[PDB]
Amino acid sequence: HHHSSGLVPRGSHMASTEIGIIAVGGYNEMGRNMTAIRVNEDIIIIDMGIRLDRVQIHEDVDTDRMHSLELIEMGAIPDDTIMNEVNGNVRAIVCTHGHLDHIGAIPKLAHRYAAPIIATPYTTALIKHQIDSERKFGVKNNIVALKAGETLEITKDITIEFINTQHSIIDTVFVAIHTPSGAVVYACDFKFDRTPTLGEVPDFDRLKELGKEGVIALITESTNAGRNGKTPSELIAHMMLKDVLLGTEESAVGMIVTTFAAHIARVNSIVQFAQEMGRIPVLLGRSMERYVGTAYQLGYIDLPENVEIYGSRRDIDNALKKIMEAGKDKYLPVMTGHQGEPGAVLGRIANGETPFKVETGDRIIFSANVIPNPMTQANRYALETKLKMKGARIYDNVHVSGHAYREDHWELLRMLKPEHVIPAHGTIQMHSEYIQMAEDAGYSLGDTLHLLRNGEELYIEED
Amino acid sequence: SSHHHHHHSSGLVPASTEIGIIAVGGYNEMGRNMTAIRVNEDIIIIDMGIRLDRVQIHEDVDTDRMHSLELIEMGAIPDDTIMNEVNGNVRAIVCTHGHLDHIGAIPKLAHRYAAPIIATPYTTALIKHQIDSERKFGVKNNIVALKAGETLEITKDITIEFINTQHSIIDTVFVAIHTPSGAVVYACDFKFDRTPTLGEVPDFDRLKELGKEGVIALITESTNAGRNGKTPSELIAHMMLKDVLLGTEESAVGMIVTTFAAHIARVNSIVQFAQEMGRIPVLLGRSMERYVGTAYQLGYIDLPENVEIYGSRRDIDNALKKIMEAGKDKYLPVMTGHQGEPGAVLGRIANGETPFKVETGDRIIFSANVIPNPMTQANRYALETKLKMKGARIYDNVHVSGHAYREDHWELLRMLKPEHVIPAHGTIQMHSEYIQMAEDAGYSLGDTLHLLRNGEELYIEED
RNA sequence: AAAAA
RNA sequence: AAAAA
Ligand SMILES: [Zn+2]
Ligand SMILES: [Zn+2]
Ligand SMILES: [Zn+2]
Ligand SMILES: [Zn+2]
Numbered sequence: 001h002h003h004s005s006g007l008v009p010r011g012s013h014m015a016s017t018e019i020g021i022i023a024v025g026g027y028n029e030m031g032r033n034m035t036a037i038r039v040n041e042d043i044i045i046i047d048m049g050i051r052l053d054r055v056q057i058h059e060d061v062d063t064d065r066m067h068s069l070e071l072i073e074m075g076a077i078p079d080d081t082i083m084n085e086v087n088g089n090v091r092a093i094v095c096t097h098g099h100l101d102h103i104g105a106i107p108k109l110a111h112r113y114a115a116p117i118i119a120t121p122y123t124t125a126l127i128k129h130q131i132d133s134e135r136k137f138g139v140k141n142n143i144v145a146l147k148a149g150e151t152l153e154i155t156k157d158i159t160i161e162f163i164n165t166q167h168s169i170i171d172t173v174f175v176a177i178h179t180p181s182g183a184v185v186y187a188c189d190f191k192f193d194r195t196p197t198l199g200e201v202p203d204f205d206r207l208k209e210l211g212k213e214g215v216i217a218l219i220t221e222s223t224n225a226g227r228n229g230k231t232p233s234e235l236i237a238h239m240m241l242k243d244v245l246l247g248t249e250e251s252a253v254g255m256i257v258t259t260f261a262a263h264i265a266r267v268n269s270i271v272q273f274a275q276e277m278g279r280i281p282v283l284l285g286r287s288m289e290r291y292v293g294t295a296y297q298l299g300y301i302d303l304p305e306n307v308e309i310y311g312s313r314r315d316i317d318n319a320l321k322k323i324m325e326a327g328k329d330k331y332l333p334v335m336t337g338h339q340g341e342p343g344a345v346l347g348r349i350a351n352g353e354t355p356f357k358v359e360t361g362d363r364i365i366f367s368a369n370v371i372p373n374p375m376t377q378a379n380r381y382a383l384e385t386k387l388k389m390k391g392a393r394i395y396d397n398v399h400v401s402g403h404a405y406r407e408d409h410w411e412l413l414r415m416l417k418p419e420h421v422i423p424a425h426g427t428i429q430m431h432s433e434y435i436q437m438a439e440d441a442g443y444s445l446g447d448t449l450h451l452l453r454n455g456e457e458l459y460i461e462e463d
Numbered sequence: 464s465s466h467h468h469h470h471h472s473s474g475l476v477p478a479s480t481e482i483g484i485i486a487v488g489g490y491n492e493m494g495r496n497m498t499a500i501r502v503n504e505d506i507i508i509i510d511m512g513i514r515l516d517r518v519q520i521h522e523d524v525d526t527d528r529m530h531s532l533e534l535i536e537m538g539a540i541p542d543d544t545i546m547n548e549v550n551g552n553v554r555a556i557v558c559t560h561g562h563l564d565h566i567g568a569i570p571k572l573a574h575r576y577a578a579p580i581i582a583t584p585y586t587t588a589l590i591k592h593q594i595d596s597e598r599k600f601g602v603k604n605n606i607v608a609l610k611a612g613e614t615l616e617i618t619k620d621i622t623i624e625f626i627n628t629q630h631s632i633i634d635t636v637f638v639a640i641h642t643p644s645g646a647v648v649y650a651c652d653f654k655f656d657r658t659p660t661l662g663e664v665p666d667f668d669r670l671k672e673l674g675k676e677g678v679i680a681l682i683t684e685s686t687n688a689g690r691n692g693k694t695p696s697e698l699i700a701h702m703m704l705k706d707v708l709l710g711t712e713e714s715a716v717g718m719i720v721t722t723f724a725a726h727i728a729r730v731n732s733i734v735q736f737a738q739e740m741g742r743i744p745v746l747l748g749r750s751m752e753r754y755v756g757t758a759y760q761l762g763y764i765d766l767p768e769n770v771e772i773y774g775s776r777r778d779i780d781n782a783l784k785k786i787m788e789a790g791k792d793k794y795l796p797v798m799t800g801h802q803g804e805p806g807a808v809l810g811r812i813a814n815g816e817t818p819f820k821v822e823t824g825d826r827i828i829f830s831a832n833v834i835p836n837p838m839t840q841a842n843r844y845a846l847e848t849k850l851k852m853k854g855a856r857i858y859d860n861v862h863v864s865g866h867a868y869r870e871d872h873w874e875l876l877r878m879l880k881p882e883h884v885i886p887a888h889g890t891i892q893m894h895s896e897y898i899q900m901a902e903d904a905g906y907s908l909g910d911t912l913h914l915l916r917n918g919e920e921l922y923i924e925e926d
Numbered sequence: 927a928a929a930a931a
Numbered sequence: 932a933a934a935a936a
Contacts, residue, residue, distance in 0.1 A: 030932060052934060099933070168933090189932095194710040204712055223932070229858040230710075232703055239702065240695055247657040247693075249667055249874055260933070286936055313936090341935035360903075363870075371933050379934095391903070393870055395692040403932080407856055411712055440854075493927060515929055563929070631928085686927070723928070749931055776931085804930040834927050866927080889927095 013463040017157075017181035019216055020459055022086055023452040025049065025078025026425050031101045033188060033425055034078035034109075035219060038457075039179045041088040042155050045113070046175055046186050046219075047095055050104025051076055056375040065136050068108045077105040082455045092154050093141065095119040097172035097189055098126035098262060107134030116142035118152065118160065120171035125294050126262075148173050149203070163210075165202045166193035166234070168402025170264045170300055174207075181462035182214035185416055188221045188425045191401070192408045195235040198265040198301070204415065211417040216462055218418035221425035224403040226433030231408055232400040237367070238269045240398050244365055245273045245332075254328035254362035255279075258338040258346050259399075261287040264295045266367055266399075267334060274332040275304055282319055284345045285336030286311040316345060321355035328362070338368040340379030350386040360391030367398045406437050413441045420460060422450045480620075480644035482679060482923040485549055486915040488512065488541025489651075489888050494564045496651060496888055497541035497572075498682060499549065501920075502642045505618050506551040508576065509638055509649050509682075510558055513540055513567025519838040527598045531571045540568035545918050555617045556604065558582040560635035560652060561589035561725060570597035579605040581615065581623065583634035588757050589725075611636050612666070626673075628665045629656035629697070631865025632725045633763050637670075644925055645677035648879060651684045651888045654864070655871045658698040661728035661764070667878065674880040680923060681881035684888035686866040689896035693870045695863040701732045704830055704861050708736045708795075717791035717825035718742075721801040721809050722862075724750035727758045729830055730797060737795035738767055745782055747808045748799030749774040779808060784818035791825070801831040803842030810842075813849040823854030830861045869900050876904045883923060884912050891916075 020038030024045075025031075031051025037044045054076040055061055063071065071077045083090070090113040095103050103123070107130055110117055117127060124145045131139045146152050148164035148171070163174035167189050175186040194201050224231070245255065259266045267283070274281035281304065283292055289311030295301050310316045323331045337346025346364070348354050358364075364387055370380050384394060404412070413421065421438050423431035431451055443449035450458050483501030488494075494514025500507045517539045518524055526534060534540045546553075553576040558566050566586070570593055573580055582590060587608045594602045609615050611627035611634070626637040630652050638649040657664055687694070708718065722729045730746070737744035744767065746755055752774030758764045773779045786794045796819075800809025809827070811817050821827075827850050833843045847857060867875070876884070884901050886894040894914050906912035913921055 050934095052932090056934090101933075192710075194706060208712075229861065230707060233706055233710075236699060236702060239699060243657060243696055244693060247655075247696075249671075249878060261935090262933090287934080311936095336935065339934060343936045344934085347935090369932075373932080376933075393873060395870065398692065401932090407858065410856065415712060513929095515927095519929090562927090564927075567929095724930090725928085750929080774931090799930065802929060806931045807929085810930090832927075834929080836927080839928080864927090 015180040017179050017462045018459065019179065019184060019462055020086065020457050021217055021219060021422055021452070022082070022457045023424065023454055024080055024082065025454055026101070027452050028454045029427060030223070032076065032078050032105065033101050034080065034105070035186065035424060036083065036086060037177050037184050037186070038086060038088045039155070039158050039177065042158055043086065043088040043090045044154065044158065044160065044177055045090055045093045045115070047102040047188065048078060048093065048105040048109050049101035052100060053373045053375050064134055067136060071108060077108055079455065080109050086457065090115045091158070092160065093117045094160060094175055095123055095127060096175060096186065097167060097169050098123040099169055099189065102189065103127050103130055107131045107139050108137060110141050111137050111139040113141070116144045118144045118146050120147060120162065120173060121145045121298055122171040122295065122300060125298065129290065163203050163206055164200055165190040166196050166199065167191050168260065169262045170199055170295065176210060179216070182216045183210055184217045184219070185210065185215050185418065186219045187412065188219065189402065190221070191231050191404055192411070193231070193233050195233045196265065197234050197238050197269055207412070207415040211415050215416050215418040216460060217420045217422060218413070218416055219422045219424050220409065220412065221403060222423035222430040222434035223426050224401060224405050225409050225423070225430060225437055227405040229405050229407055231403065231405045234265055234400060237266065237398065237400040241269055241367055242273055244395050244398055245277060250361070251277070252329040254359065255365065256333045256335060256346065256362070257365045257367055258335050259367035260338065261285065261291040261336055264292065264301055267292055268301045270332070270334050270367070271303065271307060277332065279330060279332040280306050280308065281332050281334060282308045282310070282323065283334045284310055284316050284319065287336050288334065317355055320349070324356055337383070338366050339371060339376050340383030342379070347383055350383050358387060358390040358392050362392050363395060364392045365395040365398055369397050369399050406433070409434065409437055410441060413438065420448050420450060422452060422458065478643060479925055480642055482642070482647060483549065483551070484680060484682065484885055484915065484921040484923065485545070486887070486917055486919050487543055487545065488917055489564070490915050491917045492890060495539065495541045495568065496564055497543065497568070498649065498887060499546065500640055500647050500649070501549060501551045502621050502640070504551040505621055506549065506553045507617065507621065507623065507640055508553055508556045508578070510565040510651065511541060511556065511568040511572045512564035514538065515563065516836045516838050527596055530599055534571060540571055542917065543572055549920060553578045554621070555623065556580045557623060557638050558586050558590065559638060559649065560630055560632050561586040562632055562652065565652065566590050566593055570594050570600060570602045574600050574603040576604070579607045581607045581609050583610060583625065583636055584608045584761055585634040585758065585763060588761065592753065626666050626669055627663050628653045629659050629662060630654055631723065633662055633727045633758065639673060642679070645679040646673060647680045647682070648673065648678050648881065649682045650875065651682065652866065653684065654694050654867050655874070656694070656696045658696045659728065660697050660701050660732055670875070670878040674878050678879045678881040680883040680885060681876070681879055682885045682887050683872065683875070684866060685886040685893040685897035686889050687864055687868050688872050688893060688900055690864070690868040691870070692868055694866065694868045697728055697863060700729065700830070700861065700863040704732055705736055707828055707858050707861055709740060713824070714740070715792040717822060718795060718828065719809065719826070720795060720797045720828045720830055721799065722797070722830035723801065724748065724754040724799060727755065727764055730755055731764050733795070733797050733830065734766065734770065740795065742793055742795040744770050744795050744797060745786065746770070746772045746797045747779050747782065750799050751797065780818055783812070787818055787820065800846065801829050802834055802839050803846030805842070810846055813846050821850060821853040821855050825855050826858060827855045828858040828861055832860050832862050869896070872897065872900055873904060876901065882911060885915060885921065
């Protein structure tokens with residue numbers, strides 16, 4: 001009547017954790033990143049960014065005085081009102097780096113959470129500056145500096161670990177939230193770079209050990225998941241810049257470099273090259289003086305003794321007049337304005353509102369890409385047009401991406417071996433690219449690979 | 464009553480040279496380059512290329528057997544029948560380098576001119592191979608090797624001077640034709656590179672002295688005159704390739720590199736990297752063995768003693784079987800097939816016609832761009848699809864251009880200071896980009912800057 | 927921006 | 932793929 005047809009060994013389940021991955025902002029769009037990681041009933045928020053182009057389509061603005069509510073309806077900033085419906089209390093706000101798509105909403109949203117803001121030293125300095133420029137909401141949460149390679153226990157069941165990575169701004173980290181059932185890893189804005197010009201190589205060994213210890217969930221950017229291969233090193237940008245600036249038969253001509261003021265590795269390269277060209281490096285622009293000065297005070301870069309740095313309009317204009325009457329061949333201005341922003345140094349030069357006059361053959365070196373949004377493309381087209389009309393020669397995109405490409409994501413998947421993967425930090429189209437890559441690596445959509453929309457919570461019941 | 468005055472010029476002179484610039488091929492399209500430079504009644508032909516896509520649009524076509532005329536009506540090769548209306552006699556055929564768009568039509572056209580063929584040593588070697596493959600015309604012309612930095616007297620009134628430059632094939636030169644009335648310079652297929660990984664830096668000093676001695680006319684490629692800035696050095700390709708091959712946590716995986724067989728610098732870099740990865744470099748493909756072997760026999764590259772090189776199908780399949788049964792982690796195959804050409808090694812691997820089996824995670828590295836014509840895009844799309852369907856990971860465009868960008872052209876104008884400029888080697892769209900640059904430099908179209916079409920002769924007289 | 931065999 | 936002042 002009866003036969004044996006199987007024996008199955010059952011596993012043990014000594015710890016049970018409920019994990020929630022809540023997509024708040026930056027999952028339907030570029031910008032305004034914010035994620036919530038719930039461990040049972042405690043929550044770690046990671047990043048609170050701004051989406052700058054939603055500010056740029058309205059012309060009055062000034063975000064420093066607008067209320068959270070109106071910025072959420074412009075969106076602009078993440079709609080964190082969904083957090084009233086998430087079953088837990090926030091115990092920390094973590095920011096992975098200092099770009100505005102990760103910290104820009106801090107002075108608008110952070111003050112409603114009874115939680116410290118935790119970041120790397122440079123990032124905490126920039127968060128403090130952002131909060132001091134705010135004055136409709138009174139913000140200062142506790143701000144805690146945590147370095148790459150260190151841990152901080154938030155709850156007896158939750159610890160936060162910073163893992164060094166590389167990116168287009170210094171002191172970027174992966175975040176590992178350790179729970180009784182394993183680690184949730186957040187890897188948004190990162191780049192593998194084995195020859196960084198500043199900082200250290202990403203901590204591949206520790207990525208491997210976390211992979212073997214157990215990752216419940218990887219949250220990672222999909223921004224360049226559709227670019228084939230691997231991201232070129234920042235060393236490539238450094239060498240291209242060096243050859244643009246030094247490899248020329250026209251060395252006595254006027255030259256201006258413009259780049260992201262927060263790209264401290266790029267600025268560092270430019271300043272060193274200035275020494276090699278026998279020119280005096282002159283950093284111009286409030287943002288240049290703030291970001292680079294801050295990096296210098298924290299020991300992140302050294303600066304030559306002859307560097308000059310001006311952030312105020314009168315010293316900027318004075319410095320430009322000095323440059324003009326001493327000979328542009330004697331200086332290397334490094335200035336704000338690479339996206340044609342209004343008020344920035346290079347835009348004021350291009351409008352003729354400055355003692356510096358561009359002349360035929362002067363070289364303007366954009367050590368940056370054009371942000372692919374129509375607003376910034378218009379500003380940059382107007383700026384470039386004005387400079388070309390005065391005879392400038394344009395060297396564009398002397399630059400490499402700050403983001404991981406498809407094969408970098410492949411290797412990060414192979415090292416962290418997460419049980420579940422969640423693309424973040426992009427449009428649904430970018431997540432589509434990431435999804436195809438993750439399925440070539442063995443993941444299945446809706447099972448171990450998850451596509452979230454803003455406002456959606458993924459529940460993971462881990463045994 | 465009324466009155467004015469005027470000084471009548473003297474008729475006295477205080478020999479007259481007529482220059483003809485004849486566009487034969489490559490002025491309306493990419494490929495099939497050919498220019499004739501007439502000095503009164505002597506003519507120097509420069510280049511006789513083939514245009515390969517006009518061959519690829521016809522199925523089962525053996526150009527080695529076709530007559531000149533039918534290839535001209537395919538166009539394909541330059542229509543030199545216009546030379547029956549040019550009032551001069553050809554005294555020399557110069558080739559600036561060994562790419563097929565400069566030498567491919569030599570065995571179809573050169574034999575009707577009572578003239579030597581003059582080129583650099585590597586280029587004469589490749590021209591001899593091109594003539595040995597020809598099965599329709601018996602060719603015939605004396606072949607003369609002239610090195611960069613040397614001069615050769617062609618006529619009592621005409622000498623030819625080779626000036627060293629850089630390009631994606633070794634031994635490329637600018638050509639300066641000296642006439643009683645000054646120099647006509649031909650710079651088609653050049654790149655400024657101050658850190659080449661093979662050969663010497665372009666001879667900038669001699670370009671400057673040529674500018675001051677007097678250049679009547681510059682004929683120069685417009686290929687990338689629309690790319691802003693300056694061409695990245697070949698060292699950039701060398702470092703990106705090095706980081707793709709060495710900068711990885713998955714080093715025991717299968718890796719294949721494919722690149723242009725004639726790009727001896729790239730091949731050299733790859734072979735050295737193989738030594739550094741502890742893998743054995745194995746070059747595969749008839750073209751690879753011919754181009755690389757020729758470079759080695761002439762002392763243009765050294766090769767490690769553990770190199771293996773197979774050009775015949777039997778030795779290639781045997782080598783791939785050895786690779787498979789010894790472990791793909793022990794070899795770095797460097798092979799033909801980067802444009803998905805049929806019959807090339809990587810296409811045969813991708814079709815499963817080979818003992819080598821692509822497996823999940825194997826890395827296929829294209830150290831090359833996809834040629835932008837629909838035929839080649841179709842081949843490369845079919846190849847890439849087949850490789851991806853077997854689990855391959857594709858690293859594409861690990862590569863920098865072989866051609867001057869807009870600002871390289873700017874500086875070359877600044878150094879040669881030609882009285883007249885003629886874009887060549889491209890479509891009218893590329894010449895359009897070049898024209899905008901040359902007018903920023905002071906030239907005027909139809910006066911000192913000239914847009915020519917295939918079949919047209921430009922007359923330049925002494926004032 | 928050039929082939930491949 | 933990020934601002935500027
Ligand atoms: Zn970022
Ligand atoms: Zn970001
Ligand atoms: Zn060429
Ligand atoms: Zn060419």
